[PDB]
Amino acid sequence: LLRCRLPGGVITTKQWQAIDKFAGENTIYGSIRLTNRQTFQFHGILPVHQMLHSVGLDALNDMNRNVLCTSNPYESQLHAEAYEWAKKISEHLLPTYLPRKFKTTVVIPPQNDIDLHANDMNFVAIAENGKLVGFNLLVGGGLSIEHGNKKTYARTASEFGYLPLEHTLAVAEAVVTTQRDWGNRTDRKNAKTKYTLERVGVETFKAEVERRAGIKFEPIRPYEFTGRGDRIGWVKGIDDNWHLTLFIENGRILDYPARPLKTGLLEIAKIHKGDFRITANQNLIIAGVPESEKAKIEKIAKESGLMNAVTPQRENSMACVSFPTCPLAMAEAERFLPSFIDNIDNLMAKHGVSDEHIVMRVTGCPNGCGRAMLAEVGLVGKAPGRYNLHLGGNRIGTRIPRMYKENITEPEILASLDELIGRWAKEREAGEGFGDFTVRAGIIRPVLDPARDLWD
Numbered sequence: 234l235l236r237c238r239l240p241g242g243v244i245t246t247k248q249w250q251a252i253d254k255f256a257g258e259n260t261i262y263g264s265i266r267l268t269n270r271q272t273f274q275f276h277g278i279l280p281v282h283q284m285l286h287s288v289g290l291d292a293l294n295d296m297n298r299n300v301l302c303t304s305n306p307y308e309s310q311l312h313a314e315a316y317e318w319a320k321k322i323s324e325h326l327l328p329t330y331l332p333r334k335f336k337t338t339v340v341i342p343p344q345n346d347i348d349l350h351a352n353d354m355n356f357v358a359i360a361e362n363g364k365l366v367g368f369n370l371l372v373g374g375g376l377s378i379e380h381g382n383k384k385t386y387a388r389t390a391s392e393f394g395y396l397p398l399e400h401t402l403a404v405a406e407a408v409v410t411t412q413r414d415w416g417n418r419t420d421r422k423n424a425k426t427k428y429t430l431e432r433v434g435v436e437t438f439k440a441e442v443e444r445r446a447g448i449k450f451e452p453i454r455p456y457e458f459t460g461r462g463d464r465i466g467w468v469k470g471i472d473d474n475w476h477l478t479l480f481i482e483n484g485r486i487l488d489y490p491a492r493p494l495k496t497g498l499l500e501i502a503k504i505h506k507g508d509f510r511i512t513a514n515q516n517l518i519i520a521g522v523p524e525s526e527k528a529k530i531e532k533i534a535k536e537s538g539l540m541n542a543v544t545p546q547r548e549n550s551m552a553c554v555s556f557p558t559c560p561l562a563m564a565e566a567e568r569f570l571p572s573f574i575d576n577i578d579n580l581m582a583k584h585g586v587s588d589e590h591i592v593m594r595v596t597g598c599p600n601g602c603g604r605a606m607l608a609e610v611g612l613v614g615k616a617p618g619r620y621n622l623h624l625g626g627n628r629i630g631t632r633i634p635r636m637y638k639e640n641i642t643e644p645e646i647l648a649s650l651d652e653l654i655g656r657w658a659k660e661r662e663a664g665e666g667f668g669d670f671t672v673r674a675g676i677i678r679p680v681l682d683p684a685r686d687l688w689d
């Protein structure tokens with residue numbers, strides 16, 4: 234197991250070929266696994282640092298996890314600056330010993346593809362005239378829980394305020410050091426920032442950040458999100474450039490019989506003009522394709538099975554690695570997701586909602602890597618073949634789903650969904666998501682204050 238530090242998920246075609254070769258020759262699994270934090274992992278490594286270092290890459294005492302950046306913004310021009318900032322925060326944060334891991338993101342509204350509420354520190358980009366002017370700071374997200382331990386909880390990030398672009402690094406350092414100093418000195422399960430904020434209070438933590446940073450936050454500037462999914466297919470970028478986002482199930486890049494996914498990405502890597510962008514949804518964007526090159530790239534991606542059409546449901550579903558490589562795994566996730574969604578697709582079709590989607594995620598244990606705690610329907614592994622079923626999150630990812638059923642099996646999960654999806658398909662309002670519906674319809678109580686009302 235090796236994971237790369239790759240701010241914003243941007244990787245060159247040169248870097249890609251070097252990782253493709255290594256994955257294939259020097260690992261047990263021979264795969265490249267894109268993670269939901271915009272980076273990649275090798276599994277079963279049998280030198281990697283020299284191979285990484287040779288292409289200008291590095292694997293991260295350091296609790297600083299990969300800094301994410303919205304991968305394919307609607308306002309395409311904003312990416313360059315937001316990305317430059319994710320990269321600056323990432324290096325600025327490189328070695329203070331943190332009590333727990335620290336996760337940071339740079340978000341470009343209206344997209345919350347990076348799932349900001351699962352992170353400790355978030356910089357929401359505010360732009361004027363196509364130029365970034367500052368960031369709204371949101372602090373305190375974290376999804377990890379421990380089964381039956383009501384002292385642990387998933388929490389959403391809290392708004393601190395707006396800061397001019399110039400104070401970015403000072404504010405970033407201040408949040409880190411304040412967490413480092415105030416974090417729980419005894420217990421490791423209560424050391425995350427989300428726990429610190431609840432103990433001292435947002436205003437107290439905020440006041441300290443201002444004092445340490447040497448600034449006063451300004452009122453939050455308006456922002457809103459419309460979704461968290463990738464933009465599968467071709468989208469028009471700036472100039473005559475196009476972006477082709479490819480759906481990769483579980484982000485597992487391997488050559489399969491008749492679906493040479495891995496070779497396919499290598500062939501594209503060799504002819505692609507720009508770079509690739511690994512998304513927070515475990516997908517891959519072939520970025521900066523000149524309009525003249527669209528046909529070449531598309532032919533390869535099509536032949537390799539990279540563009541096999543899936544349902545919108547499959548595109549908005551996610552799972553963590555889990556077995557066979559994870560030692561903390563309790564139930565299957567990655568290996569369970571495909572056929573599970575096969576079942577969900579049937580249910581969506583049965584109800585006349587094959588064109589709809591429910592943000593559905595499966596995490597193999599309560600650590601929550603699959604981000605099921607921010608999904609509309611989250612499955613949280615409890616034992617082999619058993620999961621806690623959580624409902625009530627929303628499409629944008631700003632609400633934690635409450636546990637609806639505990640330690641149940643797939644046939645039990647499917648039966649419950651068959652019933653709920655049917656009520657949704659028939660009772661929902663115009664454009665109402667599944668999650669919101671279960672809350673409006675009284676199927677599940679919403680989680681309004683995670684630290685206090687997440688657990689029943």
Ligand code: SRM
Binds near residue numbers: 268554600604
């Ligand atoms: C690959 C990935 C899941 C995926 O399918 O994409 C993953 C994989 C692992 N996670 Fe994670 N986590 C991944 C995103 C996250 C997320 C979601 C996110 O960050 O967007 C969470 C939930 C949010 C949060 O942090 O609160 C997450 C919370 C955990 C935890 C709980 C940490 C905590 O604060 O309690 C652990 C275990 C630990 O560190 O104690 C962990 C541990 C692990 C390890 C490294 C197991 C271990 O400790 O040895 C898993 C490796 C499994 C394997 O065999 O590859 N993983 N993990 C993601 C790698 C991210 C990255 O590239 O850096």
Ligand code: SF4
Binds near residue numbers: 553554556597599600
């Ligand atoms: S949620 Fe649990 S099983 Fe899944 S990858 Fe993370 S640690 Fe492993």
Ligand SMILES: [C-]#N
Binds near residue numbers: 602
């Ligand atoms: C998980 N890291």
Ligand SMILES: [K+]
Binds near residue numbers: 481483514
């Ligand atoms: K994916």
